[PDB]
Subunit: 307 residues, 5 copies
């Protein structure tokens, strides 16, 4: 059972695809195991770069393929390197840039909490053939959080485990529990842009919506909300065009519907005040003057939308 | 006639292109057949990964090319693996991510029922040369439906069949019935986002559109519906920018046309009310009070879209 | 002069690029020619798939490169196959997906008539060396016309010709008339979508534009025409953002100009009526009642533009 | 010093990238030079296609690499062909699609004059080793300019020159004047689409903007210009979203700014007219009748833009 | 420790990705070192182009892989060349196009000062094996600044240094200090487009926003600011649709927020004017006359952003 030691170096995690639930990761893989002692030129370890690695394999060098389980497509592999030591040991070092998959929940945008995951597992060798001895991940990140889209929080989380597959080859003794490495990097979204450029003005839009009750005439009260209605649509447009596409409603999407709700509610109330009367122009002096009622009733509905 | 057993493992179905009628599928293919017994090291199966497979083929290993009939372009092949057994049997395992084609009807969007199809067929070997014995498809997906865009319903539809080509090679006896595996996975679109962020507020727009008749003056009644027209255009725009591009009208597209219609009808009625008179400002108390006539008359247009 | 038989199988024509005058074609090419008889294992036809073809070419197998004259870039080749018959004949079969170029006029969009073209020609062997004997094209298409963007007219038109190049190598006898196969597929755009979702609502806009004349006051008449102006711009935006990009104006584009024209023309009349007087407020009783003049005057200008 | 004759065939120039100053060219390069006499099969010239050229190079065929100096990235090479003559001469033929760079000034859009340039130069061989004897360029183009985006003007300008590099290897005699072929093709933009769908309606907007002075009331005069301002915003949006992205202002971009100014200037006067009084509402009968002042002052300021 | 001299030629820096913090660089690398003296054909230096370089590596030619540290993905390599001199020395010349990463601060857009960086490091050989002797970078650029998006300032900054890695093999002597070349190119953004087409009219919107106080009636004063609000919304959209996406607010983003604030302040003031009274109709003749108060009160808040 060959013991394989892994070391992952993470350079950059970028380009999150919200729709595809995807993120790109650039870095290096280092895999080490001990083989049969070799005769190296001179006696210091022998270096075999890119092209030449295949040539060594053709001569029977065992270099096991390690698969990125949760990779989308196949990674762009940069430089490959084999370091052959005379005492037997082998070090496979290669740089990669890959597109990775993971379950991502974006409901509480733009205050989402995400975790970037890497899953490594031998493609052909089961737990009894190839075994992951240990793994350390180096997240060589730091500083300038206010410049980056994501703020990495913890340090790299690591777990070597054994994955059992129920439907495999015509093999029955016990060859089915491949050993799998799982790396986890926690991150939080930089909410600064969405607060100041979306939440804030949306708030002012919704706030200024309530100012329709301070209008004197009914004709004024009603027609203005059509302009106000037209505003929320215009804002829904600007929102939807810039925010990331998802198959569900976010906090902001809820806020927009709530905006649509306030205006349509105002429309009903304004009409109600005017034509529900006991003479003709009896605009319910108090209901037309609900100028504080549903702004704070909106603060009640606002606190429940979070609940 | 070589009997081949196939097993498909579906990891991810994502990235639907509505216009090209395209969807992406990531997974593994496993194909197995029994060859002439080989003498493997020890007696345990011999493993051959990626690069080395080609070399073995040059030495006379028969590894049949299985074509994905309904693939767009050529799929990204990840790791390749040949498992050679001493008793003869051969197992081909490879990871793939491909863009596949299938007829997709998006008329009743966002309430689609779609089906993702895979069609496997040997590229050069007919039914009498190579025949598909059986296939099981493993959709190891489950849970968290409200996070994913599509909801997979059944397990997997499977069908091995024989395709006759009328125009083929220089063969006339019977080399023309290639065997095809056809895998079908049914899915329904997650309508949650589109209902709350598109359907609902559109309804309120159309709803509030009719409130233009509760205006007192003729000028108020008329001028306001222009703002209302401008509202539907703005909403039609917001719709088009976000929704999937199609070469036909959807339910949503139809609602928008209906929006244009309701406003245009009111325009006609409002002008009519004022100018259908025996003096000049005889605004027909019944027609200016079509405040219940065509709002629920629109519910007839709504039931006709359902019929 | 080697006689070559060609068969093109068209699977899907999609992805028309309006600006580049380009369309994507997925399908198979089959080329057959008769060489000197071979000794195949047994006597059974020999099959050579992908990788192995190059090995045969290195050993002196003549497989002429057949170039797609009008392809942009180089096509995505799927599976390749050499079928070598013992009587001599050789069959090259390969799947391809390519982006093809052709002159495309989109002026009378969305009512275009286009034709999808393929041009095959030997890359290195002239007519006296290699000549295209015959070609059949199989467009295994039919049905689902109102689900698809294009309606195919013919089945497939073909023309084998000899292309004379006037400026080539320092060769003078007669080596310059390469034989070319040209396949043509006629198609018509399904204008239904653009009619209901673009032509129609634009029409309602222009129509309701004319309703500016049923307004009483001058201030109403003029101020309303500014909201009307803003609506057409809103529509111009919505149109261009969704419709295909071209280097010229379409039928839809002209309607938009016509909308702008009607309103600016209306602006001129409305101002004219008020200030062209014999007192100050003598609004010309007939010119203010141009409520029918240019609605049918636009239908006159509209019907003349069709000429 | 090997005399090399080159012939460039241009099939298609498309896909201008305004920001990157890039354009795509599809075509063929043909290179001919005379080597030491060969003994060819039969005695007529030998043809070598794609794959086989590398094999010939491995056995000592000198095929010099010709670099596209102004290519961005590395070109899509189609078919390669070596034609080996017994009298010595060798003819290299290959099809290419490449993205080329050139300084492109788009200031006077959509009335650009552009020139598409190709620069060819040997990668490793200087003027005394390899020299370009002559070059002819064939633009096999013609007809239907009103169908294409760019109108090719000239035929093709040609220039073989000697390029001196001052910093190369530690080499000193005179090995620094690589011979370079420079192909230039002039073209003019088809302004039809931009004129009718952008210049004109923008023009009508700016013109009709001035109709703000024929309004009676101050409130009307002022409030209308807010709708007028909102229109230019809408138009700026529609323009910029469709127009090519640039790092400078175009003619059309200038038109838009001119619109903002016309409207803001109107706002200032309208406020000015009103509060510059001998009572409160004494609007200077001539300043309210600046209905002719700055419309023709706009044509005076407009012609200065030509200066 | 092999002394390697490097020379980078920068052709084009283009395509900045604001979110990914990425820029594309086209150019050449030249690497020179002295090997063991060779016997070259004739006696003049031997040239080895593209394909043949691998062949030399197989026969034992040491050609060290020099890795681009801050490269995203793997660069597109154009022509490769090995120049082998008889005295021993070897020169590697290769053209490259790569996407590079660097910390990029875009806060003060469109007035960014950016620096484009290249980082070279040997992939497999440490400081005691391979040492960077010296490096010169040639940015053969100059002139035509008003045409390009970025204005290159310096002549290019250099830093040859030694990077220590702390976590590698079970190696203890001193092999962990790879030598790294870092090239820096300073650049400034061409702000012209964003000033005239974004900064300028946005200011006019804000300026004209204040003109709401020159309105006489209360309803006019209040209702007009809703058109004004909708305009800033309209403008926020146009800004966002054209300007580059970032995870933080820029000056322009701030200008828009300043607008939303200015208008909301007016809404509150206008409402305040109307209802804070000692009679009923005391619309503060003085506070409605803040027509100069917060135009300069906005200039007080505005000048604070410079400090």
């Amino acid at each position: 059972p060959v013991d394989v030691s892994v070391s992952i170096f993470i350079n950059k995690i970028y380009g999150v695809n919200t729709l595809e639930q995807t993120y790109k990761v650039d870095g290096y893989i280092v895999a080490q195991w001990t083989g049969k002692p070799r005769k190296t030129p001179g006696d210091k370890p022998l270096i075999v770069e890119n092209t030449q690695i295949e040539r060594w394999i053709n001569n029977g060098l065992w270099v096991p393929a390690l698969e990125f389980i949760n990779v989308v497509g196949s990674p762009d592999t940069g430089n490959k390197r084999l370091m052959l030591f005379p005492d037997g040991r082998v070090i496979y070092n290669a740089r990669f840039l890959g597109s990775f998959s993971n379950d991502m929940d974006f409901r509480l945008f733009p205050f989402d909490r995400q975790q970037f995951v890497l899953e490594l597992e031998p493609f052909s060798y089961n737990n009894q053939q190839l075994r992951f001895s240990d793994i350390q991940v180096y997240t060589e990140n730091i500083d300038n959080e206010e410049i980056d889209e994501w703020w990495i929080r913890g340090k790299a989380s690591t777990h070597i485990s054994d994955i059992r597959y129920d439907h495999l080859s015509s093999v029955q003794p016990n060859q089915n529990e491949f050993s799998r490495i799982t790396v986890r990097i926690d991150a939080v979204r930089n909410p600064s842009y969405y607060l100041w450029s979306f939440i804030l003005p949306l708030g002012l839009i919704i706030a200024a919506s309530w100012s329709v009750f301070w209008l004197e005439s009914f004709s004024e009260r009603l027609q203005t909300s059509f302009t106000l209605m037209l505003t929320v649509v215009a804002y829904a447009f600007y929102t939807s065009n810039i925010l990331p596409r998802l198959p569900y409603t976010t906090v902001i999407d809820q806020m927009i519907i709530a905006g649509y709700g306030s205006i349509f509610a105002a429309i009903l109330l304004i009409i109600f005040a005017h034509h529900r009367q006991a003479n003709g122009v009896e605009d319910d002096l108090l209901i037309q003057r609900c100028r504080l009622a549903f702004p704070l009733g909106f603060l009640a509905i606002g606190c429940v939308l979070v609940i």
